[PDB]
Amino acid sequence: LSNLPRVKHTLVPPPFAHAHEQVAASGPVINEFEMRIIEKEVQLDEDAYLQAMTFDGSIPGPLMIVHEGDYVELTLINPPENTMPHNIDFHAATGALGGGGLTLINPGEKVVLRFKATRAGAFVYHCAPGGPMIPWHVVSGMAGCIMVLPRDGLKDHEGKPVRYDTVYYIGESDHYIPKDEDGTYMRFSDPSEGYEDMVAVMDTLIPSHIVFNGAVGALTGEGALKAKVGDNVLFVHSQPNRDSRPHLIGGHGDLVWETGKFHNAPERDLETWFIRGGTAGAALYKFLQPGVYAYVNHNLIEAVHKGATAHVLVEGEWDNDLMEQVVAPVG
Amino acid sequence: LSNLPRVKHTLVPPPFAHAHEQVAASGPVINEFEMRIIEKEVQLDEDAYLQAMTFDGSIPGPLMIVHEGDYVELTLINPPENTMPHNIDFHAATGALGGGGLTLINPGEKVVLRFKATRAGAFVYHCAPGGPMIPWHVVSGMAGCIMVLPRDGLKDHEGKPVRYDTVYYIGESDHYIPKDEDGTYMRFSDPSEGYEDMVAVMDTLIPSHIVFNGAVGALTGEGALKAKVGDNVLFVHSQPNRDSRPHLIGGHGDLVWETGKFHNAPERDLETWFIRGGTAGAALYKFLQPGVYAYVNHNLIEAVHKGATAHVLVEGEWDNDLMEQVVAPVG
Amino acid sequence: LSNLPRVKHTLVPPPFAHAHEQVAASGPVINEFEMRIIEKEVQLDEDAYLQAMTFDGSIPGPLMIVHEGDYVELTLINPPENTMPHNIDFHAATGALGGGGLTLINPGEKVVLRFKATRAGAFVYHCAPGGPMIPWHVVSGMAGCIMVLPRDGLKDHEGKPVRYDTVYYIGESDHYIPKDEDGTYMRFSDPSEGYEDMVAVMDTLIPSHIVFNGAVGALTGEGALKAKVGDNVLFVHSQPNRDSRPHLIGGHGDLVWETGKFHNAPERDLETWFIRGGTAGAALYKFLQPGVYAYVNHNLIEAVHKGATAHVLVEGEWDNDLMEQVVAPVG
Ligand SMILES: [Cu+2]
Ligand SMILES: [Cu+2]
Ligand SMILES: [Cu+2]
Ligand SMILES: [Cu+2]
Ligand SMILES: [Cu+2]
Ligand SMILES: [Cu+2]
Ligand SMILES: [Mg+2]
Ligand SMILES: [Mg+2]
Ligand SMILES: [Mg+2]
Ligand SMILES: [Mg+2]
Ligand SMILES: [Mg+2]
Ligand SMILES: [Mg+2]
Ligand SMILES: [Mg+2]
Ligand SMILES: [Mg+2]
Ligand SMILES: [Mg+2]
Numbered sequence: 002l003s004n005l006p007r008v009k010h011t012l013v014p015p016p017f018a019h020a021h022e023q024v025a026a027s028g029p030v031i032n033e034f035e036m037r038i039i040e041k042e043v044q045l046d047e048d049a050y051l052q053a054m055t056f057d058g059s060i061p062g063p064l065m066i067v068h069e070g071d072y073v074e075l076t077l078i079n080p081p082e083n084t085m086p087h088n089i090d091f092h093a094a095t096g097a098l099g100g101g102g103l104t105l106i107n108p109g110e111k112v113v114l115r116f117k118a119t120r121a122g123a124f125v126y127h128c129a130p131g132g133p134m135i136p137w138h139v140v141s142g143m144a145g146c147i148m149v150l151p152r153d154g155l156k157d158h159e160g161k162p163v164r165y166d167t168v169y170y171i172g173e174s175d176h177y178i179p180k181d182e183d184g185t186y187m188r189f190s191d192p193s194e195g196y197e198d199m200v201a202v203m204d205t206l207i208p209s210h211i212v213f214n215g216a217v218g219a220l221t222g223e224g225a226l227k228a229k230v231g232d233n234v235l236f237v238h239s240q241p242n243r244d245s246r247p248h249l250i251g252g253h254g255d256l257v258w259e260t261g262k263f264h265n266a267p268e269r270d271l272e273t274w275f276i277r278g279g280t281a282g283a284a285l286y287k288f289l290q291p292g293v294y295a296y297v298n299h300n301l302i303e304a305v306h307k308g309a310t311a312h313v314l315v316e317g318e319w320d321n322d323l324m325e326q327v328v329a330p331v332g
Numbered sequence: 333l334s335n336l337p338r339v340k341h342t343l344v345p346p347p348f349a350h351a352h353e354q355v356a357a358s359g360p361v362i363n364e365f366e367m368r369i370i371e372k373e374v375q376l377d378e379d380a381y382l383q384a385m386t387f388d389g390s391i392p393g394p395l396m397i398v399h400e401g402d403y404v405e406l407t408l409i410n411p412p413e414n415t416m417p418h419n420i421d422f423h424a425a426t427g428a429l430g431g432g433g434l435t436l437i438n439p440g441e442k443v444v445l446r447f448k449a450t451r452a453g454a455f456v457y458h459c460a461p462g463g464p465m466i467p468w469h470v471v472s473g474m475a476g477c478i479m480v481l482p483r484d485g486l487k488d489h490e491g492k493p494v495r496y497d498t499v500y501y502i503g504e505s506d507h508y509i510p511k512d513e514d515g516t517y518m519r520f521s522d523p524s525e526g527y528e529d530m531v532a533v534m535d536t537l538i539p540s541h542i543v544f545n546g547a548v549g550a551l552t553g554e555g556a557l558k559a560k561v562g563d564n565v566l567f568v569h570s571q572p573n574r575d576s577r578p579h580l581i582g583g584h585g586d587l588v589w590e591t592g593k594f595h596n597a598p599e600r601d602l603e604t605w606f607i608r609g610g611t612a613g614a615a616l617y618k619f620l621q622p623g624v625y626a627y628v629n630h631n632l633i634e635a636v637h638k639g640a641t642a643h644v645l646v647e648g649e650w651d652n653d654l655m656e657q658v659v660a661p662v663g
Numbered sequence: 664l665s666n667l668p669r670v671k672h673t674l675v676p677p678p679f680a681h682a683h684e685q686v687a688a689s690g691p692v693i694n695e696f697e698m699r700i701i702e703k704e705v706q707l708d709e710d711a712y713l714q715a716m717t718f719d720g721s722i723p724g725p726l727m728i729v730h731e732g733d734y735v736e737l738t739l740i741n742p743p744e745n746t747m748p749h750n751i752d753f754h755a756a757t758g759a760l761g762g763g764g765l766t767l768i769n770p771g772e773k774v775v776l777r778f779k780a781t782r783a784g785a786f787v788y789h790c791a792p793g794g795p796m797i798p799w800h801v802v803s804g805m806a807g808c809i810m811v812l813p814r815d816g817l818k819d820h821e822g823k824p825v826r827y828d829t830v831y832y833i834g835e836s837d838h839y840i841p842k843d844e845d846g847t848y849m850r851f852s853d854p855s856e857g858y859e860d861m862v863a864v865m866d867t868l869i870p871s872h873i874v875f876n877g878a879v880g881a882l883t884g885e886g887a888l889k890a891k892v893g894d895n896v897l898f899v900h901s902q903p904n905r906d907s908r909p910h911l912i913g914g915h916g917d918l919v920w921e922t923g924k925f926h927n928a929p930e931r932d933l934e935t936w937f938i939r940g941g942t943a944g945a946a947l948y949k950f951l952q953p954g955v956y957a958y959v960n961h962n963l964i965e966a967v968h969k970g971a972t973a974h975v976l977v978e979g980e981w982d983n984d985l986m987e988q989v990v991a992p993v994g
Contacts, residue, residue: 074989081994090912092934096952096986098913103988110994116986120915120932129912136963184532201846203964206869207537242963244908244937246575246608250421250460251429253451262932270451270593272423273610275575277908279935279961290427299610301467301573302534324427324447326434327405332412332441515863538868577906577939581752581791582760584782601782601924603754604941606906621758630941632798632904633865655758655778657765658736663743663772 009033012063018168024154025068032067035076040083045210046217052192053142060215061172062145068152069121081109086130093124093147101129118149122262123237123281144241146281158266165235171213175243177202178209211307220311230317232288239281248273248299254284273299291317340364343394349499355485356399363398366407371414376541377548383523384473391546392503393476399483400452412440417461424455424478432460449480453593454568454612475572477612489597496566502544506574508533509540542638551642561648563619570612579604579630585615604630622648671695674725680830686816687730694729697738702745707872708879714854715804722877723834724807730814731783743771748792755786755809763791780811784924785899785943806903808943813925820928827897833875837905839864840871873969882973892979894950901943910935910961916946935961953979
């Protein structure tokens, strides 16, 4: 490998994607990424907080993008101010529990893992220190995604090349914040303090919150996603621990790889697709009409009561052939 | 469009389908449909009632059938005796939140929406007035389905034409009826009165009832579906808010589009398939043996305790080559 | 049929598979299997027990393997020491509610059912005596799987023959053990005694335990599965009543039939796949690296808190090209 080019990448925060090329402009390279683990309390909603544990300070962790056959060398840093051990498990990798058995670092330590991205697809990465710590760290926010694109870019079900203009990485996360008998949420001084109470909620399998980008409303209102009519947007969707059923209100999935692995034929014209807990899927959609759209988990209680809603504001000209109000509300 | 034929359809109640042709006998047409919103209390089971909000007086709303490339003009009526605003969101449509942003009507108003059915598949339609009203109206019963057939009819995974004799539209709906501490259900005078208590149940994500055709037992016993040996039945299955896993006890899915979009290859020989909450899927089965069958959501607690069971009684001759009792129960 | 060969099989306990050949070495045969129903209390975990009802004394029931077009003649025995009626419903069969309407046997009776295995795939079989007994017997442990292999063996998405070295049958089962207010589990003298309390837990749809091979830890530690680098292992996964999302930590699904029916194209390179409640799926993986792997349901709360974890210990040489620790934990 001393013989292959090295590319150092600067990660950007979700839902955005760092700069990259859809068709690799070179032969296999070694992609260098660095992340700092940040433990901090985050506001999930009005009066709801989580003692979170995060990759690079965001939930989800940032999206990494590489090409099939490249190597990935991740420098993971556990700063001394943190309270516990962490590691990383890449579903894109082969061996040593996804890298988790080679990356356990205590506060004050760093580690560098190299793996070959042998399989194309969007994949979850997540913390997995061992035993009960595995689910607890993930539902505390420690998960992201790496997208391994085919070297010749995405292809559809007949082998035709397809291209996107923008990638939006929707990281959906379920959380289990303990509640007082009246339904209000509990607050703690650090992650460990709230562990036993959080387990009791985890045992019910009912999340208190299910959110995109780490908080209710993160991608609504002022944080709405933007696009223009004609844009091909690839929505890469991860859910590290619980199923989701994404749907774009007013749109469709033109090409969808719900299990997220690019050499498999994508399905077309979907209304709603399915992201298995522990995976990332991807859906491409070409916007045809301007206006407000919402992208949701279509259990509408999870979308609206729990937080799994993002908005997309689209600029452009309206096409009355696709839809038209014939008789406006009247009476 | 002033230039295309217009077809006025009379909807029939689920689980049945209005008259139609599998292969369009004409070029694009404008299909005209009308529905009246009916708010009324319905009996979900012995001692369990729902203050329902329905399209055309049924749960699910009626099935609309058209062909890809046709237009759909829906006249939606909110009668003055109703208590709240409603609208319609067609997952089959493009733009304005599926039509929801163009169809909000208060009691005493009507609206007419036209959209082009550009994509083949079975799709959910549902009420979505905005915010918390979206899940609450849907789990109150406001959802149905439109099936957009390819103009040249259904095709299998090799492009072969396939045909059905009968369509049965199974609309599965999850409901969240509030309970007293002893497990008995609460009753209310109107939808609004029971809203806060219903939200508390919705927040648990555990339905009190999961039903086909709007009630426990609707399609069992006297309401059992009928068929004959040799019949090809297309079971179109919607679930607007929560996943389901349909299975025909004693049968199979010969051809199944679980994500419900007809240009995608169907899978064959399934035992159980999966309907994502917020979608409609379809399964074709040719009956080979007479007798009693049941069609269920195969979480058997949801099928039996919650209500997701229908029966099918099939007439015809038994084939001992497919199955035979060799030694009858004895001892 | 008096004219076809008969093969008597000796079933082996899950997760193993009885001896068989991938490509049938003969024309259609009549496969003879026998199972004894055993009602007994089983230890699901430290301080958690289930009054179980089992096929052949195991949970899941044993795997049967035959080829498409063969017949299956199952001798089912309900010994006189048992307390209730039981039967069997094969999702692989056509008619009479999968055989359930021809196999209801009381304690002290036997029955022999013949059916033709007309469709290739892994399929669930389970007890289904009628009404509320259907879910209760299944979540009490009465379910297994039959795998009907194509006569010419498994084929991939291009029709290429694929072969496995070992089949591991992972039977995942959800259970609903009643709890005291403090979270501890209740114990009963027999199945019937605990029925009403179990129903109350079933109604919540939240399993107390979700396990492989009938108990928490059954296939971890001393019961870890074994393999060598280079082995192609087919993981056949059943879940008779509730969804699962299998994932091999450190591995992938090379070829996966998640809906479990072999003539459908398998998907490749999956990280996590999905088993619908009421079905069996299959995933083939070639081990590339030695070490510890875990095979889990990837809702990590279900995997770790509820019991859905197995371990696989793999012997062989490590490949630093696939993964290497560049900088070991240091600081
Ligand atoms: Cu961690
Ligand atoms: Cu994982
Ligand atoms: Cu409404
Ligand atoms: Cu919708
Ligand atoms: Cu039984
Ligand atoms: Cu079944
Ligand atoms: Mg940085
Ligand atoms: Mg409080
Ligand atoms: Mg397109
Ligand atoms: Mg009418
Ligand atoms: Mg009462
Ligand atoms: Mg056929
Ligand atoms: Mg024996
Ligand atoms: Mg106790
Ligand atoms: Mg391979």
